[PDB]
DNA sequence: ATGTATACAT
DNA sequence: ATGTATACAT
């Protein structure tokens, strides 16, 4: 936002994700106010917003501490997204989707197919990730329920939890621009099952889709330990 | 808490749940501060805590509005708890549970069996609900993951979402003190599947268990429209 | 209105 | 330390 509190959130978030403000660090109002050249008031607001964002934990006595995240927490958070995305898909199958909503998601699927040429590596890496995030948002709202959309989007809220999190500009190597051809099939399958009222298949595929990220992350560890810093908010991991 | 902000949260929550502060009502700092005889400062804190609690929504321009909840939102929220509790059970099966943790949950299951005599209506309604809430907390932490415990407990956070929500003192009628005999079997089944590393069964039963509440609520609508007010936070429903 | 700084109490 | 009231700007 155009406010000190708004800016404070953006700055503090950046510092937390960069590792600058490490996990387990207690953030004091007085000292954070000093760091941001603002008073305690917009700081309290920022700390309260970053708390609902899940980057900070409120302490028992009062006060805030930066949340600790291990590779364990990356694994589980991806699993929860999968479970949630699966629930979003299953409910769309069980309950039905309006023609309008189905047209929208089918259109995004078509646009995502346009990102593929003919070769194993000929793929618009930047154009895909932007559309992929559109798909996941549509799927979250697809069953019609707001409560579901809200909760599904929250499970895909953390930086490593995000759908297009394991799609940065630098991780453009052959081991990830080949996996995407298959992820597009999963996207097609999700919709195709929803249309077919195949709840089991819908949930199953939507879960297996999130497992693509866990798969990609496990390759970044074993094949590029320096590209670890590249993933949006993977630098903050204490492992 | 022993603070104005702490008290403010407790009061505001009470007013929201009672319907006194209806859903869709914008809460202004100045006017809430007047209502609570406190200044804007502990109010801002209360509004920020009730926001992370999910009883208030932040508005685009700034400000807070009381969240609207329909019977649709009760249905979906129960479903999400089920999905989450299922995930907590499935992961406990897939990953394994320490002897200590398994002893604890098995002990709670035993204590819950003590709440049953021999007749269809001979059941400690107050003693069950308190132990039932212990079970659900144990199950949430059973797979060992903190991230899972945290997210499972959140899906069981809303007043109607809670495990022992459809177990108040007045809803002591024969249509709910008979259902509990079967819910104890579901509790046994959950643990028995976890021990047996039967992931499918664990998730399946844990989901079907939450459906007991949706079943109970659907009977309260069709058979006791005045006992609607009795459920902890069901008064705030705009249907 | 909410944003903000700040003085005083703990 | 965080809690709190409050004056001033929007
Ligand atoms: Zn995707
Ligand atoms: Zn239960």
Residue numbers in the entry:
A (entry chain A), B (entry chain A): 6 to 244
Sentences from the paper on this structure:
Here, we characterized Atu1419 as a transcriptional repressor of its own repression in addition to two other genes (atu1418 and atu1420). The structures revealed Atu1419 to be a member of the VanR group of the FadR C-terminal domain (FCD; Pfam PF07729) subfamily of the large GntR superfamily of transcriptional factors (>93 135 members in Pfam database). Like FadR, Atu1419 possesses a characteristic molecular architecture, composed of a conserved N-terminal DNA binding domain containing the wHTH motif and a C-terminal effector binding/oligomerization domain. We identified the short palindromic region composed of 10 base pairs and a degenerated palindrome bound to Atu1419 and the N5,N10-methylenetetrahydrofolate (MEF) as the effector molecule disrupting Atu1419-DNA interaction, allowing the expression of the second part of the HCA degradation pathway.
The structures of two palindromic DNA-Atu1419 complexes solved at 2.79 Å resolution (P6422 space group) and 2.05 Å resolution (C2221 space group) present a distinct neighboring crystal packing with an asymmetric unit containing a monomer bound to a single DNA strand and a dimer bound to the 10-mer palindromic DNA, respectively. Nonetheless, a tetramer, where dimers AB and CD bind each to a DNA palindrome, was reconstituted by crystal symmetries in line with the conservation of Atu1419 tetramer in solution upon DNA binding. The three monomers of the asymmetric units (one in P6422 and two in C2221) are similar with an average RMSD value of 1 Å for all Cα atoms making almost identical interactions with DNA, although the positions of the DNA binding domains within the dimers between the two crystal structures do not completely overlap. Each monomer recognizes a half-site DNA with helices α2 and α3 of the HTH motif making nine polar interactions with both strands in the major groove of the DNA. All Atu1419-DNA subunits contain a bound Zn2+ ion at the same position as that observed in both Atu1419–citrate complexes. In contrast to the protein-DNA complex in C2221 space group, which crystallized in MES buffer, the P6422 protein–DNA complex reveals a bound citrate in the effector binding pocket. This citrate adopts the orientation B described in both Atu1419-citrate complexes, except for molecule A (orientation A) in the P212121 structure. Because both tetrameric Atu1419-DNA structures are similar, the presence of the bound citrate in orientation B in all subunits of one DNA complex has clearly no effect on Atu1419 for DNA binding and DNA release, in agreement with EMSA and promoter activity. Thus, Atu1419 is a tetramer in its apo form, upon DNA binding or effector binding suggesting that this quaternary structure is the biologically active form. Both crystal structures of Atu1419 in complex with DNA revealed that each dimer of Atu1419 within the tetramer can bind a palindromic site of 10 bp, separated by approximately 10 nm.
